[PDB]
Structures are given as structure tokens and as C-alpha cells.
């Protein structure tokens, strides 16, 4: 029997660190595709 | 065959019951007798 409260298991990531890291990744990816280009991420689009 | 129902939670329409309360039969040490036991399963462990 489940005792106490019922909630949804969750994850947290610190926003400033995450955004800065994604900025660094963008900076380093722009070298392999030319300086002036646009990069946009998007969540997974299917599968198991 | 698990005869199973929903946990008596205060769920909404969208927030599906993530715990299913399922009862079924099992064979004890004495091979002649069969007992009825209940348990809880997550929604991704039961197919109709």
C-alpha cells in the first residue's frame, strides 16, 4: 500500500548553467558549418 | 488474469491514474490451495 502523498517523480537542472552550456555548444558547432548560420534544437520526434 | 481497478486518487481527466490496483490468484506452497493477493502496478506494465 502506498502511504503518504502521491506525486510525480521529477528532475531539475539549473537554468543558468544549462543555458550557458548550450551557448558554448552552439559556439563550437558553428565552426564545422561556417560562421554565419542558424541553429535550433528540437525534442525527439519518435521511437520507443 | 489480473482483475484490476484504479487507485482511489483525486485524479483529473488528463492526469491518468499512474497506479493500477490489481488483484489476482497465486499458488502457495501447498499445491492444492490457491490464494488471492493484491498489488500495485505502474500504467506501463498492464495491457488489456
Amino acid at each position: 500500500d502506498i502511504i503518504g502523498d502521491i506525486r510525480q517523480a521529477h528532475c531539475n537542472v539549473s537554468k543558468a548553467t544549462w543555458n550557458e552550456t548550450l551557448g558554448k555548444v552552439v559556439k563550437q558547432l558553428r565552426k564545422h558549418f561556417g560562421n554565419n548560420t542558424i541553429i535550433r534544437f528540437a525534442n525527439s520526434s519518435g521511437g520507443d | 488474469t489480473l482483475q484490476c481497478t484504479n487507485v482511489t486518487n483525486n485524479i483529473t481527466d488528463d492526469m491518468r491514474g499512474e497506479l493500477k490496483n490489481c488483484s489476482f490468484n497465486m499458488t502457495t506452497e501447498l499445491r492444492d490451495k490457491k490464494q488471492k493477493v493484491y498489488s500495485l502496478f505502474y500504467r506501463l506494465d498492464v495491457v488489456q
Partner: antibody
Amino acid sequence: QMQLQESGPGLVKPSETLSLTCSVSGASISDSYWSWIRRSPGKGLEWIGYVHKSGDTNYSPSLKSRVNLSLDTSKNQVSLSLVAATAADSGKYYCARTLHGRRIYGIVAFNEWFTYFYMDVWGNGTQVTVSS
Amino acid sequence: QVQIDISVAPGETARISCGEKSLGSRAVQWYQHRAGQAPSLIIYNNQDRPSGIPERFSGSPDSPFGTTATLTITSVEAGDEADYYCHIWDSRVPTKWVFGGGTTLTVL
């Protein structure tokens, strides 16, 4: 500092509406929620329903189609109306003031909370006796 | 519901119970009813109380488990004779529209 004046004849023939009006004197109708309570012998007093600020009232599941509520802004009062009354709904009626409640136990972004309503100011009550 | 008769000796505390303990986070309500006078609340949250009413009364905080909502009447007074009703807000098990089983407190 609001005094709720319950006006009701208290007598209605069977299979007819039992209408009572709780007039508002001390305050304005749009200050907090209005709820209604019915006390009858044999059971404790019952919280029969309430009225939202936007007129989106809620009723008990037992008598959702038997009783109705209305709110009027021209006259500072609330109105309650039973439909097809029988001899078992007689007793005492109270119009009461109710405050919004918001206690959080999970994560707001994922819902996980409940809206509880309670009582802080009651009326002096009215007695209704329905019989042939 | 049932008007169970419970009496408390003056000068000693009393403990009143509300049945059907739930199994989650709760928001308790506790109202009184004294004949011939206007009923009013006593407890609106487990550890939060309305102004005006003297400090003598208190309610059980259900933050740990196994702590049923028990109404504690400390320093009882001859004017405390009334009917005490419970309206339980409960998380897992659904909304309780009807108030819980009441109690009748009389002063001996």
C-alpha cells in the same frame, strides 16, 4: 462585519420550489464566496454547495439536479431554490461566507494541490418546515 | 451525525476525535454549534486558527503520519458545552462533501 438576513416563508407544498433569499447588508456580494448549509435531524449539518465569484456555482453530487443557486448584482442577495421538495428536506438553512483556500503539497507546475473552502461568518439561520 | 455524549471534568483537557482517517496531506476543518446562538468556526487549518476565539483550543497537525485529527480542548470552560463537527479535506481519497461524525461536549 456583515449581517446576512435570511428571508424565507419556510412552507412549500410538495413537488414545488422551496425558495429562500439571503440578503446582504454589511458587505458586497463580490467580496468572497457564498455557500449554503442544511441541517436536518438524524444527520450532521451538510454543506450543500457554494457560488463562485463569476457565478459558476457548484452543488453536491447527491442533489445536483434537485437544488439551484443564483446571484444578483442589482440587489445584494443570494437566492436558493429547491426543486420538487419532499418531507425529508425540512430543517434549518444557513447562508455562510467562504474564503478561497490554496494549500500546496506537490509541484504547482504539475498541478498537485487542492482548493479548500471553510467558514468564517455564518448567518443566524432560518427554520423551514415542509409538510402537507 | 451521531450525537455521542462526551463530558469533561472542569480544569482538565479533553480530546475529541473525527472518524475515517485519510491517507495523505490534509486540510482540517472544525466548527461548533451552540443552541440559541450563531455557529462559528473553531479550526480552519491544523496549526492556523482564526482570531477572536481564545487560545484554549487547538488541533492536531498531521505532518507526520499516524497523527489523526484530534481536537484538544485545554483549560475547559463551563461555556464550552456545544456540538463539534469536522469537515475533512483529504488528498488521495476524494472530496468529503458531508461533514464528519459529530460530537456533543458537555461540562460536568
